[PDB]
PDB file of C-alpha atoms in Angstrom:
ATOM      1  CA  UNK A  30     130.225  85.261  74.715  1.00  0.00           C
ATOM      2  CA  UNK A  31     128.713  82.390  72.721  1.00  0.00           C
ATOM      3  CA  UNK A  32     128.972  79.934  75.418  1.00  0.00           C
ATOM      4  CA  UNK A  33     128.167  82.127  78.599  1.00  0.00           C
ATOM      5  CA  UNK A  34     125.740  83.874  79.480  1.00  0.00           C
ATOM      6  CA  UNK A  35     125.959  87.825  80.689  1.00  0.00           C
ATOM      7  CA  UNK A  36     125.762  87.127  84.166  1.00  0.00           C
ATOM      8  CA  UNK A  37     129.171  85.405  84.415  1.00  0.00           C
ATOM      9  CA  UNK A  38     130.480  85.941  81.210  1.00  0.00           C
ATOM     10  CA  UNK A  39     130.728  89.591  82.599  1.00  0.00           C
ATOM     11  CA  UNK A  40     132.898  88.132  85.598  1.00  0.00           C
ATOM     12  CA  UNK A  41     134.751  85.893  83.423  1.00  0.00           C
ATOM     13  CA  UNK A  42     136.067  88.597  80.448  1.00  0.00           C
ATOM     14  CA  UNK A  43     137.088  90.871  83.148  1.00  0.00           C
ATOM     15  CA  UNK A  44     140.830  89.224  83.863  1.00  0.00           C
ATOM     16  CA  UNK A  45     140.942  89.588  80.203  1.00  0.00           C
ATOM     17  CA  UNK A  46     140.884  93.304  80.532  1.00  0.00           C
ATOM     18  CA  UNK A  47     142.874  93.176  83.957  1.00  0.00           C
ATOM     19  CA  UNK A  48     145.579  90.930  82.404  1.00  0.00           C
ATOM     20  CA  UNK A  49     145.849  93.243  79.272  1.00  0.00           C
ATOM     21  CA  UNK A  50     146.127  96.251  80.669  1.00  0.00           C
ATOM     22  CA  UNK A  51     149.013  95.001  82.892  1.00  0.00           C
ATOM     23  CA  UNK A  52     151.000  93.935  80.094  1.00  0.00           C
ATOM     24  CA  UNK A  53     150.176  97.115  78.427  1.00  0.00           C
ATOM     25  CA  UNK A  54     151.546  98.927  81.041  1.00  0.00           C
ATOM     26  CA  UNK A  55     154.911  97.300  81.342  1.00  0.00           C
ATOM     27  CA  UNK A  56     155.535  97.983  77.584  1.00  0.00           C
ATOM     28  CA  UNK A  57     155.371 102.347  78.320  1.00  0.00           C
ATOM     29  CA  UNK A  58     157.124 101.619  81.337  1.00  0.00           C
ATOM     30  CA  UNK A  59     160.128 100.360  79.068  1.00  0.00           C
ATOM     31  CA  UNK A  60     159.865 103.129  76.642  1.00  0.00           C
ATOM     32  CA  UNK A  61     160.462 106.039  78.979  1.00  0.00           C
ATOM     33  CA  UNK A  62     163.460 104.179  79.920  1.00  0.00           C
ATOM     34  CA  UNK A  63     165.044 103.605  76.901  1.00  0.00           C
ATOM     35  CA  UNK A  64     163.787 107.314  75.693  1.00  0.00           C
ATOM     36  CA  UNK A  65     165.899 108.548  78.354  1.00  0.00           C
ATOM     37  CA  UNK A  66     168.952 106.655  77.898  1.00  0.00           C
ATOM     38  CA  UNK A  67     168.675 107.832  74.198  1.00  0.00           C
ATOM     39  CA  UNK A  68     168.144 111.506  75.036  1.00  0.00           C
ATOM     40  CA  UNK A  69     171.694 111.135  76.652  1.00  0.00           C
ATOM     41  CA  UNK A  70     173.514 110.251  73.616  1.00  0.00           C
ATOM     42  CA  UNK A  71     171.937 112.877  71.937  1.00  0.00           C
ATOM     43  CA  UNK A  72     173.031 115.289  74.585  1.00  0.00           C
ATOM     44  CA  UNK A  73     175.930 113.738  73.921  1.00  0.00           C
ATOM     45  CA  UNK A  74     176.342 113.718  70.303  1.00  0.00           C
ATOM     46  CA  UNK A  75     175.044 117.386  70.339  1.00  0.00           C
ATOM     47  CA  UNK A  76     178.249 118.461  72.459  1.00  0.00           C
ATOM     48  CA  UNK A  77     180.598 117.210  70.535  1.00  0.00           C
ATOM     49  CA  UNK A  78     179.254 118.243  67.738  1.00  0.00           C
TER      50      UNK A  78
ATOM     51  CA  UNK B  28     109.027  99.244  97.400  1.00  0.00           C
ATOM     52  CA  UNK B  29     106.879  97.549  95.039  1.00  0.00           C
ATOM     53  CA  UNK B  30     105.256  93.533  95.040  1.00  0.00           C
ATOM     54  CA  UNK B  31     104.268  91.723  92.534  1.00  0.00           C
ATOM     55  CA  UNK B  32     103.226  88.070  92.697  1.00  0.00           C
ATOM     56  CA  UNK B  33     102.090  85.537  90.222  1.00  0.00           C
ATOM     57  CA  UNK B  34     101.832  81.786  89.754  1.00  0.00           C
ATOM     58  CA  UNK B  35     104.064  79.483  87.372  1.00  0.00           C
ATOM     59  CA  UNK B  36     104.727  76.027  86.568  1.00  0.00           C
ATOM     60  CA  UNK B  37     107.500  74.429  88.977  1.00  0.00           C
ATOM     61  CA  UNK B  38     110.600  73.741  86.444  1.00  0.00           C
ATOM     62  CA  UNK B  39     111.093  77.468  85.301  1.00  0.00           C
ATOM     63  CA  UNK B  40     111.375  78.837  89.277  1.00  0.00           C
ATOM     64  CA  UNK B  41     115.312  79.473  88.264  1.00  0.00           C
ATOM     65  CA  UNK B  42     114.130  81.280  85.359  1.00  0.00           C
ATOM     66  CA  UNK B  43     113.164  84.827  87.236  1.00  0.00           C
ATOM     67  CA  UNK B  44     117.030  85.835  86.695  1.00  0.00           C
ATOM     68  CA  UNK B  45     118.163  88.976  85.331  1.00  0.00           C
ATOM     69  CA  UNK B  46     120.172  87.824  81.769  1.00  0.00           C
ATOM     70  CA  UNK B  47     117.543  84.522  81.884  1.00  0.00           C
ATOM     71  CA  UNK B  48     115.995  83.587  78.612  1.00  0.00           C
ATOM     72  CA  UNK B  49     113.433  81.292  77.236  1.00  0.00           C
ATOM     73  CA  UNK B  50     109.502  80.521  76.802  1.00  0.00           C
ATOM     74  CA  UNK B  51     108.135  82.579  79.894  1.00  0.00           C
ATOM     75  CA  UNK B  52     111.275  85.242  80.424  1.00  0.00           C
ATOM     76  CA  UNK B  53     110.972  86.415  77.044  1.00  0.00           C
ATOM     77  CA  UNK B  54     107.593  86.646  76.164  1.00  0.00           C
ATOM     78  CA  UNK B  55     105.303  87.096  79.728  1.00  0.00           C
ATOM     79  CA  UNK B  56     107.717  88.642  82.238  1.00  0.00           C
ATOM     80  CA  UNK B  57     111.352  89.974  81.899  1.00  0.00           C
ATOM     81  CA  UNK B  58     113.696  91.470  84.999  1.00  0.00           C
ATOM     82  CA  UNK B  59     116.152  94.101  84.505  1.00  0.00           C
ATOM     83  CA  UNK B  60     119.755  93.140  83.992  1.00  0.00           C
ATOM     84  CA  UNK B  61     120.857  95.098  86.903  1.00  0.00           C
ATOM     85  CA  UNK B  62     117.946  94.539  89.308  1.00  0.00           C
ATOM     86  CA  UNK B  63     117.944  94.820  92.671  1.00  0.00           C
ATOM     87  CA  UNK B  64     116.047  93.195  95.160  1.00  0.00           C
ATOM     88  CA  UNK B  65     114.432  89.859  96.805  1.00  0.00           C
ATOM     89  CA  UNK B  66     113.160  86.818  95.898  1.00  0.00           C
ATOM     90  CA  UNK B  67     110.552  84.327  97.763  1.00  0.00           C
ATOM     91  CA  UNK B  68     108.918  81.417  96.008  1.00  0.00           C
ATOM     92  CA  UNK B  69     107.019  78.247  97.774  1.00  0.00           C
ATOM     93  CA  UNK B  70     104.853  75.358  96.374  1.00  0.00           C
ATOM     94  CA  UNK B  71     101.384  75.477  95.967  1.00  0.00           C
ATOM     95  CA  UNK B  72     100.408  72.303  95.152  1.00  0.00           C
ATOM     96  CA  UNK B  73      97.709  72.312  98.215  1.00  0.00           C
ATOM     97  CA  UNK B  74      95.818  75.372  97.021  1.00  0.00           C
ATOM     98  CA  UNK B  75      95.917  75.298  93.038  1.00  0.00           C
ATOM     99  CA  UNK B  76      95.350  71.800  91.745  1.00  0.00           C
TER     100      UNK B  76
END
């Protein structure tokens, strides 16, 4: 912002937002994976208990 | 639709921007950031000096 002014700066910050949210996305994605894959070894662990 | 017309000095023509600053697009006459609309200009060097 204190190089640009709004008119492009606008353009310019948005593949920030676009490029964050992507990774942000990919790091959920993992986590109901791996909370499934742990919810079987509790299901597990719960039977033979 | 509404006109409005006016005469400046040649050098600040690129000035009538929305986001534009300086001297005359700060202090005389200022266009909204999300304006809409057309823009004509021309010299008048034969009928103003």
């Amino acid at each position: 912002l204190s190089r640009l002014d709004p008119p492009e700066a606008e353009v310019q910050i948005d593949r920030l937002i676009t490029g964050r949210l992507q990774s942000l996305q990919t790091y959920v994605t993992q986590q109901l994976i791996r909370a499934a894959e742990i919810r079987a070894s509790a299901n597990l662990a719960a039977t033979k208990m | 639709v509404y006109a409005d017309s006016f005469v400046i000095r040649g050098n600040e023509v690129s000035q009538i921007a929305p986001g534009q600053t300086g001297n005359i697009a700060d202090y005389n006459y200022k266009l909204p950031d999300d304006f809409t609309g057309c823009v004509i200009a021309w010299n008048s060097n034969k009928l103003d000096s």
